[PDB]
Amino acid sequence: EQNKDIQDLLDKIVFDAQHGQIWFDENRMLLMHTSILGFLRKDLYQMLGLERTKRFFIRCGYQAGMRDAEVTSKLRPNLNEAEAFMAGPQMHGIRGMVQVEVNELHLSHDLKQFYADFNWLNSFEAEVHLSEFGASDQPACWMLLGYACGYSSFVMGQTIIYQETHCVAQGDEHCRIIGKPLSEWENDAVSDEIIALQAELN
Amino acid sequence: QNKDIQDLLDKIVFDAQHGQIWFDENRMLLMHTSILGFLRKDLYQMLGLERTKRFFIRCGYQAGMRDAEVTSKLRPNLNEAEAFMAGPQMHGIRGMVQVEVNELHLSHDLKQFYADFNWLNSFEAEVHLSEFGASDQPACWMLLGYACGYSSFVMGQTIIYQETHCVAQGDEHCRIIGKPLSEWENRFMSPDAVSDEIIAL
Ligand SMILES: Oc1cccc(Cl)c1
Ligand SMILES: Oc1cccc(Cl)c1
Ligand SMILES: [Zn+2]
Ligand SMILES: [Zn+2]
């Protein structure tokens, strides 16, 4: 009943248990335990730095988001930009990663304007960071954030960068993101700009 | 309709508008294969083949061992084998590989185990080819770790598997044999040891 706005995404998702395949369009997916991701995060933290691991998860996110945008934009072009755009927050929820709540969204491909202010509820990534590292000094939703940048940059024609302003792992009540184009942030690896940015803010 | 996997499927709840997927009390993610692709490339160049192979067997091991935890108490009025089959069934459910049984016998009590399985549609084989191309050896490291983690848990002893054929080498399907440590021709600290056994093959 309650899937009017996501059904077109769901119709692309095909479970084939008997042949060991899950498909989103012509792309295989895997059902995985969030706790195995936390294990992976920690083992990567141990082998490489905090920085390399961070950067691993952002670049991964970034590819996943770009890939999903490739898929979700080939279809849904009878709609206006905002309804089209919303596939990305919908895919994040459909994949089990985070619930997106929109505070603000303004965008125009042709004006090269973008500004997003979303809340992130029940982020899996924050959960597993607390589980492996305990309370954090910095925002923890690295993979989710690269996905946001990747999805959003593909859909716009340009580098959109997000910042996680509040994070459940830091003890905030929910997580929160803000997305603008690169140069709107005063003052390839766009993962270095995301990482560099979070240091310049406080 | 048509399922001997329904007791497993029942436990999976998708809740997309709260951003959640569940298996029993445990939370899950539908992921891209790209993450594992990257991990595999990144580690190949940062760490070399041997360390990248072990890392993947280790991650598969931990997952297999976690499915075995969750599925353990679930089939008491079925025999040891029909219960064990959760592992192979879960692998298929999760979009990883399809398991066709050639042979399977096991006794916990007699400490006996032989498994000969075909692996069809291995996501891992596909990811190896698309990043490194043809292998010279079996490449389904994660899948193999899982087999070892799950089976070793259930049998309460070290079960090691050999991938005898692999789509990554140009064979038409992947194949594995699992037996106990002993039968081969030669908590946490024990997993590291088990993972190292199943890497020297
Ligand atoms: O969760 C998010 C946030 C912004 C954009 C997208 Cl595509 C997903
Ligand atoms: O795919 C497999 C193969 C053997 C055991 C398990 Cl639990 C899964
Ligand atoms: Zn967060
Ligand atoms: Zn293989």
Contact between residue A82 and residue A62 where contact means Cβ atoms under 8 Å apart: no
A184 among annotated binding-site residues: no
**Ligand sitting nearest the alpha carbon of B144:** 2
Structural domain including A107 reads 1-202
- At B60, the amino acid letter reads G
Rounded Cα distance between A150 and B41, Å, is 20
**The two three-digit tokens of residue B57, written as one number:** 């067997």
Contact between residue B34 and residue A71 where contact means Cβ atoms under 8 Å apart: no
What resolution in Å is listed for this PDB structure? 2.5
Q: How far is the CA of B108 from the centre of ligand 2 (A)?
A: 17
90-129 in chain A: CB under 8 A from chain B: 90, 92-100, 121-124, 127
Rounded Cα distance between B51 and A87, Å, is 38
Contact between residue B112 and residue B97 where contact means Cβ atoms under 8 Å apart: no
Q: Tell me the chain B residues in contact with residue A123 when contact means C-beta distances shorter than 8 Å.
A: 19
Residue B45 touches partner A, C-beta closer than 8 Å: no
Closest CA to A59 of A143, A158, A155, A181: A143
Of B74, B91, B103, B116, best ligand 2 pocket probe by most atoms within 8 Å of the beta carbon: B91
**Does any ligand 1 atom lie closer than 6 A to the CB of residue A24?**
no
B59 among annotated binding-site residues: no
DSSP class of residue A135 equals S
Q: How far is the CA of B102 from the centre of ligand 2 (A)?
A: 13
- Which residue of chain B comes nearest to A94, CA vs CA? B16
Beta strands, E only, chain A: 13-16, 21-24, 27-33, 99-108, 113-121, 160-166, 175-181
Q: Whose CA is nearest to atom 3 of ligand 2?
A: B147
Q: What share of chain A is helix, strand, coil (3-state, %, to 5)?
A: 50, 25, 25
Rounded Cα distance between A147 and A58, Å, is 7
Contact between residue A59 and residue A187 where contact means Cβ atoms under 8 Å apart: no
Ligand 1 atom closest to Cα of A144?
1
Residue A19 touches partner B, C-beta closer than 8 Å: yes
User: What angle, 0 to 180 degrees and rounded to 10, lies between the N-to-C axes of helices B49-71 and A34-47?
Assistant: 150
Beta strands, E only, A46-137: 99-108, 113-121
Is the CB of B95 less than 8 angstroms away from the CB of A121? Answer: no
**Ligand sitting nearest the alpha carbon of A92:** 1
Rounded Cα distance between B23 and B10, Å, is 9
Instruction: Mark the residues whose beta carbon lies below 5 A from ion ligand 3.
Output: A 123, 126, 141, 167-168, 175
Technique behind this structure? X-ray
Unique residue bearing structure tokens 């009943």: A1
Contact between residue B1 and residue A17 where contact means Cβ atoms under 8 Å apart: no
Question: How many angstroms separate the Cα of B178 from the Cα of each of A180, B83, B173, B181?
Answer: 53, 17, 17, 9
Domain count for chain B, please give it: 1
- Which residue of chain A comes nearest to B40, CA vs CA? A56
**The two three-digit tokens of residue A182, written as one number:** 């690169």
Contact between residue B105 and residue B94 where contact means Cβ atoms under 8 Å apart: no
DSSP code string of chain B = ---S-HHHHTTEEEEGGGTEEEETTEEEEEEETHHHHHHHHHHHHHH-HHHHHHHHHHHHHHHHHHHHHHHGGG-SSS-HHHHHTHHHHHHHHTTS-EEEEEEEEEETTTTEEEEEEEEES-HHHHHHHHHH-S-SS---HHHHHHHHHHHHHHTTS-EEEEEEE-GGGT-SSEEEEEEEGGGS---THHHHHHHHHTT--
Q: How many other CB atoms are there within 10 angstroms of residue B2's CB atom? A: 6
Report the residue count for chain B.
201
Q: How far is the CA of A87 from the centre of ligand 1 (A)?
A: 8
Unique residue bearing structure tokens 């305990």: A134
Rounded Cα distance between B58 and B74, Å, is 25
